[PDB]
């Protein structure tokens, strides 16, 4: 789930 790290920055 490393690729889903940038998603956290969107929030």
């Amino acid at each position: 789930t490393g690729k889903a790290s940038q998603f956290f920055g969107l929030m």
Side-chain angles (χ1 to χ4, degrees):
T1 343
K3 216 125 173 175
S5 168
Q6 58 127 257
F7 248 56
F8 268 110
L10 209 97
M11 226 156 74

